[PDB]
């Protein structure tokens, strides 16, 4: 066991679970929505080409990010 | 024992480091064996549950 091999397993699980959470948050494959689900605005072309399947424009997205930063 | 403590607390201060039992028996009037047994009288032994 050596006490660093188990530490290795712990670190491996920690990094992998973090990596895959931050990957699942991407949702690359998606739907062409074409209009914001918050303000109905035109989600500009470049943002839909970068993130296929967005649901918020950058303004509503950053807004939501602030709140989910604090919590709730 | 209270008198021994008093005389020692005074003598250590006035005499320097500490009173050796010959010095206490001289300063006191005791025969210096009584003083030694008074010193050897144990004190408040200990809780046997003390940590190690």
């Amino acid at each position: 066991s050596d006490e660093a091999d188990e530490a290795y397993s712990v670190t491996e699980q920690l990094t992998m679970t973090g990596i895959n959470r931050i990957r699942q948050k991407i949702n690359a494959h998606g739907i062409p929505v074409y209009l914001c689900e918050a303000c109905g605005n035109p989600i500009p072309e470049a943002r839909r080409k970068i993130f296929p399947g967005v649901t918020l424009c950058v303004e509503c997205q950053a807004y939501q990010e602030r709140q989910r930063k604090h919590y709730a | 024992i209270n008198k021994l403590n008093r005389i020692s607390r005074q003598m250590l201060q006035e005499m320097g480091r500490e009173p050796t039992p010959e010095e206490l028996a001289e300063r006191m009037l005791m025969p210096e064996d009584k003083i030694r047994k008074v010193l050897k009288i144990a004190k408040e032994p200990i809780s046997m549950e003390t940590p190690i």
Partner: protein, 1337 residues
């Protein structure tokens, strides 16, 4: 230019980065800190002066008397460190304190004193820290570890969503003072700001803003922005406010600005700001949700239409509008950025004014008592704004001002209204998203104490205890003839310091395994201890490494196990601030040029700068060579332009600690392997003969010198006389200090016992008539080698399986390593025979021992003690002691036996001191201690006359060496100007202190040196007298002990299976076999491999550093063996100079340069002879040898570039397929020995209350068969195994003896009875009121 002890053996050094800041004195913490403590602070702010100024001047009851502190000094001790360790006491100094007492009459309060009295009273002894930062507290050597505790100031921390179900984070700000109450602000889940004063009941936060005499209009002016509407129903507009999801659309001048419902955006914000829109119009319904800002009344009756913080509805809008009201002010309470919190808190806030708020505070603090206006106001003002009850210290105010981002590092000590309003704004701002919480393991919140500050605190505690008694004694009588000696008894002042230095979690035995262990144990920071967190409450919080640890704490080095991250080690260049916060040096970077001067930055400042990397290439003018240089800003590391960077790391090593700086190729190891490797280097016991690492770093000389193991010169000179015990140096005449005699003596520390029973022993390095320069080492300490730290030995290791003999982590050691005594360690252990006086008389150290039959008494001399020179084994009698006793009525058949043989009873036990089992050493020493009552025995008078002759000889031999040196200097003075050069030797040496010379200042010199030798004579005389007094004077032994005989058994432990070898890269093992040398793998030249290793350990444990080290050691040894071949065939120094100089410049642009061309032809032969075992090599920690230079250095020898040679099997001699890796790894013998562990017991001692076998190997104890072993036995069917482990082998006092009788009878059956543990349980339940019993069978 190379030091003369440096040209002896030059470690070749990779590490292309040029070194700018040379490594500090590694023990600066301990020594600096204890310097500040016991030292005459003239402007008293440090150490004893501050404590004395803080208690004094004491003033008497009604000011009749004043006890005033004049000054202190430290009386010189009674014994030095060696004498303290022998005698067994704390090496301290008396604290003699000159005090003054002035007494006043009537009508002269400050007026003329009736009389004063001066006297130097003695208040306790402070232990003295030795020259290494260690104390001697009870004869043993302690180290006081530095502590790491939170500092005063304001801390912003959140629950990070754990507490509330929704997850909503709740931010609190805490003002922790130095002394005083803990103001704390914290959010409610409804986002109401509360304040609690001492972890007491929660109050609304604005209750305290009213307590500071504010009103609601003022509070809303402080915390909010006034959206001002005017008049219709027009809105003044700040376009930045409406960032946006926008309520009303937006319009001005009638055309349009934005249409409603769609979210407000940056483009439309641009449009409003561009078209200069100040006033727009909103309806009568949008103003229905805002909050009124201030008072609004009717002029008709002077009646209040609406207060402040009151909701504004359409009715009130109409009512104000009809009052001719054009202006209205509303709180700008956004939901995301400018959140409304003071508004809701003022809602919940029941009070209104300072009176009712103070009453609320009073009820919370002093509850139930009927309050008053005056009592409430007084309590509140005494909370935070009375100077005698609330203190932000200098650290506290520094952190409070800096944490609020103010530029006033210095300030008051009490809070203020503004120091609370800024705290509340910062709290609300953290909640608004501008700003972040504090990290707890952030090293800007935690500061370090050390010996100076902790001891000063204990001394202040003692001083307050003194102040009590002195005030009361100046209360009673105050009569004359009462002086400042009777009022102060030294016991309770010295009591706290004694209790701390002896009995504290931080005063702990220094680890002396080897020098590196001491250097790390002194440079240690601890989060534990009295004042810091406890192991139970820690976390999960401060075990973690934090970005502010860069350059301050070693991320590698820390114990694994119960406290990871609770005990870190100080980094290499880490330092302590003025205030106590850790810091680290950076070379300042002007515009692009990397300036040379260096500033120390602490974790608070280090964030807001941009700090380049130490491995950043540069031009010669100091510019960077890369456009985007990778530097770490506040928390992260990114590529910044070369213009932006402000500071740069002082070195590549500055992130590690001195332990983990000794791992070569540390960059190639997984970080935890580095942790284990460092922690195991701390445990390497020093071998019999030292061996420097063939692959080091260049840290070894620093660790060896800066610790006190090696005797270093103080002044250059010549080695007048060497010896196994002493080195005499005749100084260069440049460094004589004209009063001095010239020569200085170093007395080596011979075979002595360290805390771990190892042998500390210094060996001379220099030889007769050889130069030295100040800073050169004269004596190699334990586990150093020619000045360098040499922990273990460099072995010719092979990596390959070999027959399951290095299977899990085992090691397969050759018999040749066992023959060369490479890992043989001298251990030393002291065994004490205490003869006390029992209640039937005293016990004797006699040799007329009972039954033992004149063979065991063969070693013992007449007085009963073993000879210094005898080799005992386990069981031999070191000290024969016979004890009194009674008769005890020997049973019949013993009566009958002694009646048949007439061997009458002894009456005297044989309670003597025999050697413990398994040890077999030489008795190297014997000390005796007789109390002043007990006369002495023959051995005691013998040892005393021997110590007497030694002391006299030492003093005289020193004095005559010094006299001969001073006569040489006097004769050099007598060469001109009143000169006698050929008759100077004619008259006798003693007729030279009366020598004539012309009337100059140099006949003055002769007379001066003469009278100074007279000083030598007389002070030598008083030295001899005091020495004879100390040697002869009786000892102050503990109460009741007549005398203590201490034998010192020196054992020599050899390597054996079960011993634990280990590498510097976390590769630890356990010798499983000691292979015969012809059974080991050999190469094609006949060379067995010294040690065989498992290649399996390397891939999974990602420490390939041991592989690169094996390759580099193969290269180094290849170089050195080529040198040995040249040096043995007597190749001329042409050949040696050529080859050695070709090997000393290898690698791409290394910093080091050596030119053997500027080398004496004898200094190349010495250097060659030292490089004939192998060329030492250095590899700085993140700077060292690239693999291609390893390959080149292999090509320099005739070794293969691949590093893998082909090996043959020892037993059969057929070549292993697919060649193996063999090089030189540097192994270390860890202090986990197999005979300090192997323990066994059939039947021995049994504990008194619970009749179980004793616990431990020292008690010859049994094994703890616990609960889980019992489940394992129940999971089989072993019903009998368990019944006998629990009954007969443990606790059943009557069945254990019957089992023994049966086993020797050859009848393996147990009648188990019943355990004593259950009997004691039954009696203990019965001694409660319960009646428990065992029914009829």
């Amino acid at each position: 230019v190379y030091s003369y002890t440096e040209k002896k053996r030059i470690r070749k050094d990779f590490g292309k980065r040029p070194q700018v800041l040379d490594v500090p004195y590694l023990l600066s913490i301990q020594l600096d800190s204890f310097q500040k403590f016991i030292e005459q602070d003239p402007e008293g702010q440090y150490g004893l002066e501050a404590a004395f100024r803080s208690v004094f001047p004491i003033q008497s009851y009604s000011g009749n008397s004043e006890l005033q502190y004049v000054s202190y000094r430290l009386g010189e001790p009674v014994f030095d460190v060696q004498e303290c360790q022998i005698r067994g006491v704390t090496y301290s100094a008396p604290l003699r304190v000159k005090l003054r007492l002035v007494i006043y009459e009537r009508e002269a309060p400050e007026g003329t004193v009736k009389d004063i009295k001066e006297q130097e009273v003695y208040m306790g002894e402070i232990p003295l820290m030795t020259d290494n930062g260690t104390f001697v507290i009870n004869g043993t050597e302690r180290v006081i570890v530095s502590q790491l505790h939170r500092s005063p100031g304001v801390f912003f921390d959140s629950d990070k969503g754990k507490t509330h179900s929704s997850g909503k984070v709740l931010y609190n700000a805490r003002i922790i003072p130095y002394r005083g109450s803990w103001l704390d602000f914290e959010f409610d889940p409804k986002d109401n700001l509360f304040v609690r004063i001492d972890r007491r009941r929660k109050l609304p936060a604005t209750i305290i803003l009213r307590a500071l005499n504010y009103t609601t209009e003022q509070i809303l002016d402080l915390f909010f922005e006034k959206v001002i509407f005017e008049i219709k129903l027009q809105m003044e507009l700040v376009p930045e406010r409406l960032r946006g999801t926008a309520s009303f659309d937006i319009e001005a001048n009638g055309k349009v600005y934005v249409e409603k419902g769609r979210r407000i955006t940056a483009r439309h914000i641009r449009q409003l700001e561009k078209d200069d829109v100040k006033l727009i119009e909103v309806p009568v319904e949008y103003i229905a949700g805002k909050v009124v800002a201030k008072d609004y009344i009717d002029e008709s009756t002077g009646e209040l239409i609406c207060a402040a913080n009151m909701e504004l509805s359409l009715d009130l809008l109409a009512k104000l509008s009809q009052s001719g009201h054009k202006r209205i002010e509303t709180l700008f309470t956004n939901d995301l950025d400018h959140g409304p919190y003071i508004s809701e808190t003022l809602r919940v806030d029941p009070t209104n004014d300072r009176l009712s708020a103070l009453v609320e505070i009073y009820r919370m603090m002093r509850p139930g008592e009927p309050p008053t206006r005056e009592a409430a106001e007084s309590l509140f003002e005494n909370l935070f704004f009375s100077e005698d009850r609330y203190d932000l210290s200098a650290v506290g105010r520094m952190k409070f001002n800096r944490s609020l981002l103010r530029e006033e590092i210095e300030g008051s000590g009490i809070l203020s209204k503004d120091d609370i309003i800024d705290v509340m704004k910062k709290l609300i701002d953290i909640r608004n998203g501008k700003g972040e919480v504090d990290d707890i393991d952030h090293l800007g919140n935690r500061r370090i104490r050390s010996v100076g500050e902790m001891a000063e605190n204990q001394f202040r505690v003692g001083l307050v205890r003194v102040e009590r008694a002195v005030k009361e004694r100046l209360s009673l009588g105050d009569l004359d003839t009462l002086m400042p000696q009777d009022m102060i008894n030294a016991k309770p002042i010295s009591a706290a310091v004694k209790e701390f230095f002896g009995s504290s979690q931080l005063s702990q035995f220094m680890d002396q395994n080897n020098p590196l262990s001491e250097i790390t144990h002194k440079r240690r920071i601890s989060a534990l201890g009295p004042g810091g967190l406890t192991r139970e409450r820690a976390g999960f919080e401060v075990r973690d490494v934090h970005p502010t640890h860069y350059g301050r704490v070693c991320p590698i080095e820390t114990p694994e196990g119960p406290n990871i991250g609770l005990i870190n080690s100080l980094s290499v260049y880490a330092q302590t601030n003025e205030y106590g916060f850790l810091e680290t040096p950076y070379r300042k970077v002007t515009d692009g040029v990397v300036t040379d001067e260096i500033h120390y930055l602490s974790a608070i400042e280090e964030g807001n700068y941009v700090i380049a990397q130490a491995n950043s290439n540069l031009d010669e003018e100091g510019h960077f060579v890369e456009d985007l240089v990778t530097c770490r800003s506040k928390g992260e590391s990114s590529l910044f332009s070369r213009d932006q960077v402000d500071y740069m790391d002082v070195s590549t090593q500055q992130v590690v600690s001195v332990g983990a700086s000794l791992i070569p190729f540390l960059e190639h190891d997984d970080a935890n392997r580095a942790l284990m490797g460092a922690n195991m280097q701390r445990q390497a016991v020093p071998t019999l003969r030292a061996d420097k690492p063939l692959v080091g770093t260049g840290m070894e000389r620093a660790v060896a010198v800066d610790s006190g193991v090696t005797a270093v010169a103080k002044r250059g000179g010549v080695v007048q006389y060497v010896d196994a015990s002493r080195i005499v140096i005749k100084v260069n005449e440049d460094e004589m200090y004209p009063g001095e005699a010239g020569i200085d003596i170093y007395n080596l520390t011979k075979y002595t016992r360290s805390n771990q029973n190892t042998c500390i022993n210094q060996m001379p390095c220099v030889s007769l008539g050889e130069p030295v320069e100040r800073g050169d080492v004269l004596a190699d300490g334990p586990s150093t080698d020619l000045g360098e730290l040499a922990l273990g030995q460099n072995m010719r290791v092979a990596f390959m399986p070999w027959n399951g003999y290095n299977f899990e982590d085992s090691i397969l050691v050759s018999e040749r390593v066992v023959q060369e005594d490479r890992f043989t360690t001298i251990h030393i252990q002291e065994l004490a025979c205490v003869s006390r006086d029992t209640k039937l008389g005293p016990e004797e150290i006699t040799a007329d021992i009972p039954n033992v039959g004149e063979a065991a008494l063969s070693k013992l001399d007449e007085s009963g003690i073993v000879y210094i020179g005898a080799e005992v084994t386990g069981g031999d009698i070191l000290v024969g002691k016979v004890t009194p006793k009674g008769e005890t009525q020997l049973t019949p058949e013993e009566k009958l036996l002694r009646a048949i043989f007439g061997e009458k009873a002894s009456d005297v036990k044989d309670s003597s001191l025999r050697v413990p089992n398994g040890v077999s050493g030489t008795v190297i020493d014997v000390q005796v201690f007789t109390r002043d009552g007990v006369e002495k025995d023959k051995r005691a008078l013998e040892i005393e006359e021997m110590q007497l002759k030694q002391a006299k000889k030492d003093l005289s031999e020193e004095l005559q060496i010094l006299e001969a040196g001073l006569f040489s200097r006097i004769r050099a003075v007598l060469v001109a100007g009143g000169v006698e050069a050929e008759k100077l030797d004619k008259l006798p040496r003693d007729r030279w202190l009366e020598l004539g010379l012309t009337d100059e200042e140099k006949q003055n010199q002769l007379e001066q040196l003469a009278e100074q030798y007279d000083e030598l004579k007389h002070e030598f005389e008083k030295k001899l007298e005091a020495k004879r007094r100390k040697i002869t004077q009786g000892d102050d032994l503990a109460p009741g002990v007549l005398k203590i005989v201490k034998v010192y058994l020196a054992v020599k432990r050899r390597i054996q299976p079960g011993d634990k070898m280990a590498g510097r890269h976390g590769n630890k093992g356990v010798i499983s076999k000691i292979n015969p040398i012809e059974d080991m793998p050999y190469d094609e030249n006949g060379t067995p491999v010294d040690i065989v290793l498992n290649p399996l350990g390397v891939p999974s444990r990602m420490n390939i550093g041991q592989i690169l080290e094996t390759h580099l050691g193969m290269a180094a040894k290849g170089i050195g063996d080529k040198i040995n071949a040249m040096l043995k065939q007597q190749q001329e120094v042409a050949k040696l100079r050529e080859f050695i100089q070709r090997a000393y410049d290898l690698g791409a642009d290394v910093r080091q340069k050596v030119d053997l061309s500027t080398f004496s032809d004898e200094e190349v032969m010495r250097l060659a002879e030292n490089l004939r075992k192998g060329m030492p090599i250095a590899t700085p920690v993140f700077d060292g040898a690239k693999e291609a230079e390893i390959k080149e250095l292999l090509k320099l020898g005739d070794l293969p570039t691949s590093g893998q040679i082909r090996l043959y099997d020892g037993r059969t001699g057929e070549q292993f397929e697919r060649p193996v890796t063999v090089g030189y790894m540097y192994m270390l013998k860890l202090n986990h020995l197999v005979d300090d562990k192997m323990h066994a017991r059939s039947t021995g001692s049994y504990s008194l209350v619970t009749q179980q076998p004793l616990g431990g190997k020292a008690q010859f104890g049994g094994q703890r068969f616990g609960e889980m072993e019992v489940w394992a036995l129940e999971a089989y069917g072993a019903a009998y195994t368990l019944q006998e482990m629990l009954t007969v082998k443990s606790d059943d006092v009557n069945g254990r003896t019957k089992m023994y009788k049966n086993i020797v009878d050859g009848n393996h059956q147990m009648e188990p009875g019943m355990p004593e543990s259950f009997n004691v349980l039954l009696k203990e339940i019965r001694s409660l009121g319960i009646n428990i019993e065992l029914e009829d069978e």
